[PDB]
Amino acid sequence: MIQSQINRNIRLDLADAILLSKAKKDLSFAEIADGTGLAEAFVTAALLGQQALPADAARLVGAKLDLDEDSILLLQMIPLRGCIDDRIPTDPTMYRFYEMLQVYGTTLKALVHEKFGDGIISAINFKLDVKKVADPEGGERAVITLDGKYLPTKPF
Amino acid sequence: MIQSQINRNIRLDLADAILLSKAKKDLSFAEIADGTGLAEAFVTAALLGQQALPADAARLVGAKLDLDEDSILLLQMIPLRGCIDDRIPTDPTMYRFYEMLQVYGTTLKALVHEKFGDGIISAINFKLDVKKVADPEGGERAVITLDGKYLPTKPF
Amino acid sequence: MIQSQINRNIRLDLADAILLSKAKKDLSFAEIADGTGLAEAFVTAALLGQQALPADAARLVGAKLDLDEDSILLLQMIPLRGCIDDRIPTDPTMYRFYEMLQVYGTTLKALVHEKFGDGIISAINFKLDVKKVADPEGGERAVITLDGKYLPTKPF
Amino acid sequence: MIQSQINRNIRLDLADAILLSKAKKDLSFAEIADGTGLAEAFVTAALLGQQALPADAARLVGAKLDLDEDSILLLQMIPLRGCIDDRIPTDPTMYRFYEMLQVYGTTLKALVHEKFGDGIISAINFKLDVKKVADPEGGERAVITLDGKYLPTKPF
Amino acid sequence: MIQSQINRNIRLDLADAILLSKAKKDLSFAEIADGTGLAEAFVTAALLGQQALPADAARLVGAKLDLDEDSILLLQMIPLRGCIDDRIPTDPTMYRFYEMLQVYGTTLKALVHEKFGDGIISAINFKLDVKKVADPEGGERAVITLDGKYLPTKPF
Amino acid sequence: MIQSQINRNIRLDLADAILLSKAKKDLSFAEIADGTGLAEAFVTAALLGQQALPADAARLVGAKLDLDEDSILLLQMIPLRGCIDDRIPTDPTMYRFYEMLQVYGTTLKALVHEKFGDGIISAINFKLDVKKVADPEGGERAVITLDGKYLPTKPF
Amino acid sequence: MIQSQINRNIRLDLADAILLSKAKKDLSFAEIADGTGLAEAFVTAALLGQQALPADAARLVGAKLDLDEDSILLLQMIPLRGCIDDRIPTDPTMYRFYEMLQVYGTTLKALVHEKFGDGIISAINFKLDVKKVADPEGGERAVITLDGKYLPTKPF
Amino acid sequence: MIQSQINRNIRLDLADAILLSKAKKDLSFAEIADGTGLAEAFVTAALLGQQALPADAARLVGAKLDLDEDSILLLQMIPLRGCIDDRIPTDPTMYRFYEMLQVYGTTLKALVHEKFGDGIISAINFKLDVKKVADPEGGERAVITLDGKYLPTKPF
Amino acid sequence: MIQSQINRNIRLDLADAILLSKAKKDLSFAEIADGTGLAEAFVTAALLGQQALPADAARLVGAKLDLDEDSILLLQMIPLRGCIDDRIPTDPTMYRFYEMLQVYGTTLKALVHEKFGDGIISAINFKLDVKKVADPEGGERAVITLDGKYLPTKPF
Amino acid sequence: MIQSQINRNIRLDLADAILLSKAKKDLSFAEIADGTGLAEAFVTAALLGQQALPADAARLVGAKLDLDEDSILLLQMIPLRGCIDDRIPTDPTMYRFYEMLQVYGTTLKALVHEKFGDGIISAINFKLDVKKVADPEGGERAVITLDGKYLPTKPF
């Protein structure tokens, strides 16, 4: 609750171990998150080193993955966040989300200031979820919802 | 439309002039897009240099903003896309969306592969929506919907 | 209000013009902010391109600095913020504040998580001021107060 | 004391081990610093590799954390300072303090020169402390005090 | 297949081990890929950490390369793609393909927009082929076929 | 042709003017190259500042685009090549070709070494073709042919 | 004197104009500094945008260089310091001083901590002097004296 | 001595070992250099990976530091020099010497060309020396003497 | 000659003007350097902003290119050297010399220390020339001679 | 040889081991190369990771250095070339060759296009050697000969 990391490599190393154990057990993130009470994106993010799990969720997911005591502890620590290796993703799947920022980043800024005003949409007071929908033209689409609080800049 | 740009600075300089004109006329992006048949995010992105407008939309927004013939032409050209000055935004409003990537980038990758499979969520066959919703704890929230086609990696 | 910039160079150019007028008129920032009802740091930051002034304060500082209508309008527009040229300051005076980050950044993180919890000290819901005090050993000290709202990360 | 480091990884690796020990013993930084006669920010910074502890303080914190002789000696050596992994923090909590510089860096410069003159506010002859205060609109705020000697530029 | 990697080093370290075993056994990539039902470029890319192999191909190449159970599993996992160490290749053989981008990048953009329209040529719905042909002037030429689906940008 | 540039901005500025003229005349690159005897990709590259045109092709395309004498001369000068603004493209259309390198770069190296031996595929002794083909799945594909001389590394 | 710059380009552009004027009048820096009562390195640094001249010195050097009133004013303002274009000098003469840092930077740190203790040698309370002296083995040597106040790191 | 290194990490790792041993033995760099016949800055630099020690000095300091044969041999190797981790020091103590270049770099260039001519002050034919002197204002100063051979750029 | 530049853009802008004049007059660099008494590489370098010409050569090459008095003056000024735009060339022709470094840089270091000892091959006391020779296998070869003084690192 | 590497660290680690073995045996690169039939620069480059040795030469140099069978195999593999740690060398000896590129890089481009035409001097069909010669004014010089095939840019 008050313990925090200053070096992302410890939690990212743990994430690698979790993913191998996860693959050996043929688990999905959905089922690791099941029974946790937390959204699959939050639990996934914690496993990947970017969130802290409450001790209860940490023990549960720890049991599904056969994690030792130190690992379960580590998952509860407030991480040094930052999942991109070197600022810009190389992975195509992650790059596409960077690309939407290169295409729509100033549009998001302009529409945030138009609809809300001066300030930010929070990445902290924030939820995300990923939804699969059919494409009427065929195939499938991802509907990803970014739900952040508006925080105004206020003069003083 | 077969005409395209190779230097983002031309459309970005145009964007600056559009924004001054827009500020002098006290126009909103919602207003500028009304009548085009195009979503405000698409029209905004085009004004900010990140999309091409079809000829009819360009004429109509050019009328609202008092643009000359060359500016109306430039709005129709396929842009050299990339709205971030130097890869990482400095602007807090813009930066928060990059931070969502630093926190959740690997989670989005993980969940895309879990829900869809190997491949990408498209930034091209893609729709963006920004809604303002009340926050039940007070204040306002932005609900940003990313709607991208899933394209699977094809083994061959 | 609703109008925002996407290119910081416009307001930073304006800032340079403001600084020359200010020096020619022998004005202090304290003098310029007097009568705006806004703190010297906020007004200064707006002059330097990093905040928007409300219309009345914009007109008043515009009167003191002999600014034209466009400039007074630009001062009200929401900026593309980011005052550092290329990520790390070269200026010794500005660099010292980056050095405090290099020496204390992980301490600030550690102590914020210890005293507040998982989350951030906001730079948006934020006040700062700069006070000159006597040094008991001789000379003077700056006491810079950063007053930022704590925003918790909560799971979802 | 006359001994110093040239590679920050040694002290930073030590910091990682310290943080694990600290988390396993559920210690706060306040607790570790109590009895040293040193402020919590200074002691914390030392644990995190950014300050040297005096021999007595090093023994004392070394006792509280089960550190070996070599680790206690390491805490006394003058560090190679620099806590940010790669110039710009990725972690949201530390990033906000960088953002404070991106928004107010030039304002801090301007006001330091106005109030003090040509020179710097020291990061070396320097104290900081972090205060939690209640926010009258609800929630909490961090009052972070940066207290640095003013050192004027000497013409010669 | 729903298992994916978030750290390219794991698969890249495996690639190194694969290449040593491949060299000791005097195998070619064409030989490894034979019987797999998959193109040599796709199988090679998988070995080098950039594609996932289906289970039967993974087992077959694992038999040919004398890989352990864990390595054969890692070959099936969806990778964190990105084979270039630090954005720009240093290796002359790889650099030449980057140099074709530096010379023809804008030409490819221009001609894609001319022939197909606004949008992209996919790197995902994509096949590549490398053919050796005689050079009429003596020596040999590589004919590398990039076969990518066109994906239009659509207004919305 | 012995005249060469050392600063790409000159030819890239020229490219921008060409593209504007080309758009006003509603010309395709295919049409511009018709009658030069040069492949459309080579002529396009020259217009975009990455190749030199022979004098007669330069006059021909210069007539078609109504270029002045200095522009026609600049088109003949050997360029300072490099069409990417800052090493990595921001534009999605050009990015995909960089991504093919991030995915297949080491595969191309491996297969070049297997099929040809130690050395490089040339970007200089090189031809490229962009072909549109129907996709049996529906839609269209780009078949891009990179045709490069193999130059071996030889011991000395 | 309380007026300061935030954009180094104004004073650097002024420095370029000064250097051309200086070259046209065939003045040395020593001559320009003579009569100001200030050391040649200080006056020179001011002309090059890195120091503020006192009003008397400014008018004196401005008379020598035929600077206009605005330029004399600019020389008096506290600069945004930072004379290196992009962090690492490309110029051989400037680079050697950087190389001195690459070879002896950690030695300077070590010996400063040995002889003085934990702290810094100031670049602010600082004088530098360049002397020409004969090399006994023939040729000349520069004896560059860096004379910086030692400021200790203060615990608290 | 004809043996040279190509990877600075070997000698820098050795430097770290040396510094630990030196600290345990409570040795000063002055002591370690005593009796080598070499200036303390040279011996220090060699220990820190930036110079080669002659065999007699290497044996002498190796005795004082209890180094094994391989270490004593490594100290004699010509190093791959470069003591700064990533181009710009983060350490305040080392940073000040970089700041000296950011403030006076162009002044050093200017005055070298004025006093000596076109060319460089050598970092190779080069002596440095650190003296402590009393400050008349109280406290201490470092007089750091850079003594470099001038090498002219001569036309050919 | 004691006048020096601190901003390379002045001389590089001059180089661009020189090159257009040179192309218009269809001059070669051999012809321009003829009669100056200086090697073609030295005079070319000076035109391209990387060397200072002596006054007579500057007048001579200035006459050939109809340069005004200011330009002839600029050619005599000691430049701020550095011809690469951004550290790594993009142009294939220049990149090959960088690649030569990437392939042979450590070999050059190794052989310099083996043949000469600790020290450097000077880029200042240095000559280069470029010779065209026939390739007995057909075609042409460039024989580029780098001729630099060895300066040893000597202990002190 | 059809086996190739994708990760430069394998061969560079091996190069470090070779250098230690070489130093213990006090071998020069000249004697290691003796009897291979290969130039000392080529053999050295291979040992340092930048070339592949033929099987015979690998077994010979491996006998001289006591290399195991896997190391001898590795030396035969086509490397992932790139000897500079991070794009720009820090080592003064290596840096000087980069500085030659910073001073003469555009001169080399200009003279190559003048003497050969549009194209490149190859770094692949390429030889180098390093010759020691006496300086008439005392001391020694390195005469480094770069011998590369000219390859013309081919239109199509």
Please write down the HEC assignment for all residues of G26-68.
Answer: CCCHHHHHCCCCCCHHHHHHHHCCCCCCCHHHHHHHHHHHCCC
I29's CB contacts (< 8 A; 6+ apart) are I22, I40, I43, I44, I47, J110, J111, J114
Whether J5 sits inside 8 A of E12 (CB atoms) is no
Which stretch of DSSP H or E encloses residue J130? Answer: strand J119-134
**CA–CA distance, F46 with A132 (Å, rounded to integer):** 45
Q: Which residues contact A82 (CB under 8 A, 6 or more apart)?
A: A8, A50, B102, B103, D89, D90, D91
Pair H90, D84: CB distance under 8 Å = yes
Contacts of residue A58, Cβ cutoff 8 Å, sequence gap at least 6: A72, A73, A75, A76
Other CB atoms within 10 Å distance of the CB of residue G56: 12
Q: What are phi and psi of I66, to 5 degrees?
A: 40, 60
Q: Helix I55-64 and helix I69-76: axis angle, to 10°?
A: 140
Pairing of strands D140-152, E119-134: unpaired
Chain H neighbours among G 52-71 (CB < 8 Å)? none
Give me the residue from F29, F104, F114 closest to E28, CB to CB: F114
**Cβ contacts of residue D147 below 8 Å, gap of 6+?**
C141, C142, C143, C144, D126, D127, D128
Residue in chain C nearest G122 by alpha carbon: C92
**Torsion sign over Cα B44, B48, B52, B55:** positive
Sign of the CA dihedral running B12, B13, B18, B19: positive
**Does the CB of A28 have a partner CB in chain F at under 8 Å?**
no
Q: Are residues J71 and J103 in the same domain?
A: no
CA angle, C7 then C10 then C16, to 5°: 135
**C97 with C63, same domain?**
no
- What resolution in angstrom units was achieved for this structure? 1.9
Residue G100 CB coordination number (10 Å): 22
F40 contact residues in J (CB cutoff 8 A)? none
Is residue G111 less than 8 Å (CB to CB) from chain I? Answer: no
Method: X-ray
Angle at C87 between CA C82 and CA C93, to 5 degrees: 85
Residue G24 CA from chain centroid, whole number? 22
Under DSSP, the state recorded for J155 is: P
Q: Which residue has the tokens 């039940």?
A: B136
Contact G21, G67 (CB under 8 A): yes
Residues from chain C contacting residue D30 (CB–CB below 8 Å): 114
Q: Does residue H70 sit in the same domain as residue H104?
A: no
Q: Determine, for residues J15 and H7 on separate chains, whether the beta-carbon distance falls below 8 Å.
A: yes
CA distance H44 to H58: 12
Q: How far apart are CA A21 and CA A27, in angstroms?
A: 9
Same domain, E58 and E108: no
- A84-88 contacts at long range (C-beta below 8 A, 24 or more positions apart): A84/B101, A84/B102, A84/B105, A84/D90, A85/E7, A85/E8, A86/D86, A86/E86, A86/E87, A87/B87, A87/B88, A88/B87, A88/E87, A88/F88
How many other C-beta atoms are found inside a 10 Å radius of the C-beta of residue C156? 15
How far apart CA E83 and CA E12 sit, in angstroms, is 8
Contacts of F137 (CB under 8 A, 6+ apart): none
The position carrying tokens 């500042």 is F49
Cross-chain residue pair F91–B81, CB shorter than 8 Å: yes
Instruction: Indicate the burial class of D138 (C-beta count within 10 angstroms; 0-12, 13-18, 19 or more).
Output: exposed
Whole-angstrom distance, CA of residue E120 vs CA of residue D61: 59
Taking the CB of residue F138, how many other CB atoms lie within 10 A of it?
A: 8
Question: Cβ–Cβ of H118/I54 closer than 8 Å?
Answer: no
Kindly report the CA angle at G94 between G93 and G99, in degrees rounded to 5?
A: 100
Q: Do C3 and B16 touch (CB under 8 A)?
A: no
Q: In Å, how far from its chain's centre is CA G59?
A: 19
Residue with tokens 């352990």: E68
Give a yes or no: residue G125 inside a domain.
yes
One-character DSSP codes across D21-81 = HHHHTT--HHHHHTTSSS-HHHHHHHHTTSSPPPHHHHHHHHHHTT--HHHHHHHHSBP--
Give helix C55-65 / helix C69-76 axis angle, nearest 10°.
Answer: 140
- Residue A132 sits at the chain B interface (C-beta within 8 Å): yes
Could you tell me which chain B residue has the CA closest to the CA of E153?
A: B124
Distance of CA D35 to the CA centre of its chain: 18
C-alpha I41/C-alpha I59 separation (Å) is: 18
Count of domains in chain B? 2
Domain that holds residue J38: 8-76
Residue D65 near residue D22, CB atoms below 8 Å: yes
Q: What is the DSSP string of E26-95?
A: T--HHHHHTTTTS-HHHHHHHHTTSS---HHHHHHHHHHHT--HHHHHHHHSBP-----TTSS--SHHHH
Q: Are C112 and C147 in contact (CB under 8 A)?
A: no
D81 annotated active-site:
no
- Distance (Å, whole) CA I110 – CA C23: 57
Q: What is the dihedral of CA C60, C62, C64, C68, to 10 degrees?
A: -140
Contact (CB, 8 A) for C118 and C95:
no
Instruction: Identify the CA nearest to G132 among candidates H111, H143, H153.
Output: H111
Same domain, B42 and B102: no
Are F61 and F31 in contact, with CB atoms under 8 Å apart?
no
Does some domain include residue G81? no
Kindly give the residue spans of alpha helices, DSSP state H, lying in chain G: 8-24, 29-33, 40-47, 55-65, 69-76, 92-115
Is F137 buried (19+), middle (13-18) or exposed (0-12) by CB count in 10 A? exposed
Is residue D83 assigned to a domain?
A: no
| Cα E5 to Cα E46: distance, rounded to the nearest angstrom | 13
Q: Which of J122, J130, J156 to mutate to test the interface with F (most CBs of F within 10 A)?
A: J156
User: Is F24 part of the contact surface with chain B (CB cutoff 8 Å)?
Assistant: yes
> Is residue C55 situated within a structural domain?
yes
User: Which of E90, E94, E97, E135 to substitute to test the interface with I, most I CBs within 10 Å?
Assistant: E90
User: What H or E segment, with its residue span, contains residue J122?
Assistant: strand J119-134
Strand order from edge to edge, sheet including F140-152: E119-134, E140-152, F140-152, F119-134
Is the residue at H85 inside a domain? no
Backbone dihedral region of C73: left (phi > 0), alpha (psi from -120 to 50 degrees) or beta? alpha
First to last CA, chain B: 33
For chain E, the straight-line distance linking the first and the last C-alpha, in angstroms and rounded, comes to 33
HEC states along chain B?
Answer: CCCECCCHHHHHHHHHHHHHHHHHCCCCHHHHHCCCCCCHHHHHHHHCCCCCCCHHHHHHHHHHHCCCHHHHHHHHCECCCCCCCCCCCCCHHHHHHHHHHHHHHHHHHHHHHHHCCCEEEEEEEEEEEEEEEECCCCCEEEEEEEEEEEEECCCC
User: What residue in D sits closest to C134 (Cα-Cα)?
Assistant: D149
Judge if H12 and H62 occupy the same domain.
yes
In this structure, the strands spanning G119-134 and H119-134 are unpaired
Written as one string, the DSSP assignment of F67-121 is: --HHHHHHHHSBP-----TTSS--SHHHHHHHHHHHHHHHHHHHHHHHHT-SEEE
Q: Which of C97, I40, C111, C2 is nearest to D121 (CA)?
A: C97
Report which DSSP code applies to A90. -
Last residue of a domain, which of C47, C76, C105? C76
Active site residues of A: 96, 99, 122
Respond yes or no: is residue G99 known to be catalytic: yes
**Residue J3 to chain E, least CA–CA distance (Å):** 6
Contact C112 D130 (CB under 8 A): yes
Q: Which residues are D134's β-sheet partners?
A: D140
CA dihedral over E83, E85, E91, E97, signed as positive or negative: positive
CB-based contact, C31 to chain D, within 8 Å: no
Strands ordered across the beta sheet of I119-134: I119-134, I140-152, J140-152, J119-134
Identify the domain boundary among C22, C48, C76.
Answer: C76
Taking an 8 Å cut-off on Cβ atoms, the answer to whether F102 and A88 are in contact is no
Q: Is C124 helix (H, G, I), strand (E, B) or coil?
A: strand
Q: Which amino acid, residue J120?
A: I
Question: Under an 8 A CB cutoff, do J90 and H84 touch?
Answer: yes
Cβ-based neighbours of G118, under 8 Å, separated by 6 or more: D4, D52, D78, G152, G153
Helix (H, G, I), strand (E, B) or coil at A118: coil
Q: In what order do the strands lie in the sheet with A140-152?
A: A119-134, A140-152, B140-152, B119-134
**Whether E18 and E56 share a structural domain:** yes
Distance from CA of H36 to the nearest CA of C (A): 36
Task: Give the CATH number, domain containing residue D140.
Answer: 3.30.1160.10
C102 and C54 within one domain? no
- Interface membership of C104 toward H (CB under 8 Å): no
Nearest by CB to H6, which of I38, I52, I110? I110
Closest CA to C111 of D150, D143, E136, G113: D143
Which ranges constitute the DSSP H helices of chain A?
8-24, 29-33, 40-47, 55-65, 69-76, 92-115
Domain stop point among D28, D50, D76:
D76
Contact flag J102-G90 (C-beta cutoff 8 Å)? yes
Q: Which of E8, E28, E32, E91 to mutate to test the interface with J (most CBs of J within 10 A)?
A: E91
D60 and D110 inside one domain: no
CA dihedral F13, F17, F19, F22 (to 10 degrees): -160
Chains that touch D (3 or more CB pairs under 8 A): A, B, C, G, H
Residue F66 lies in a domain: yes
Among I46, I43, I98, I40, CA closest to I77: I46
Active site residue D21: no
| Of D60, D54, D5, residue with least CA distance to D31 | D60
d(CA E120, CA E102): 18
Eight-state DSSP code of residue F138: S
To the nearest whole Å, the CA of B28 is away from the closest chain E CA by 19
CATH number of the domain at B71, please. Answer: 1.10.260.40
Chain-chain contact of B83 with C6 (C-beta, under 8 angstroms): yes
Residue E94 Cα, gap to closest chain A Cα (Å): 16
Quick one: tokens of D118? 């040509």
**Nearest CB to G124 within list C15, C24, C92:** C92
Taking a C-beta distance cutoff of 8 angstroms, is the pair J43, J29 a contact?
A: yes
Q: Contact A124/C155, CB-based, under 8 Å?
A: no
Region for residue J147 given its phi and psi (left: phi exceeds 0; alpha: psi -120 to 50; beta: otherwise):
beta
Annotated active-site residue in C99, C137, C140, C141: C99
Cα Rg, chain E, nearest whole Å = 18
Option in A109, A141, A147 nearest B94 (CB):
A109
- Whether G1 is in a domain gets the answer no
CA atoms of D26 and H2, how far apart (whole Å):
55
Asked if the Cβ–Cβ distance from J23 to H10 is below 8 Å, we say no
Q: How many CB atoms lie within 10 A of CB D123?
A: 25
Residue I2: phi and psi, rounded to 5, are -120, 0
Which whole-number Å values give the CA distances from C133 to B69, D148, E145, I121, in the listed order?
Answer: 60, 10, 71, 55
Place of tokens 């006359």: D2
J partners (3+ CB pairs within 8 A) are: E, F, G, H, I
Residues E96, E60 within the same domain: no
Domain assignment present for E3: no
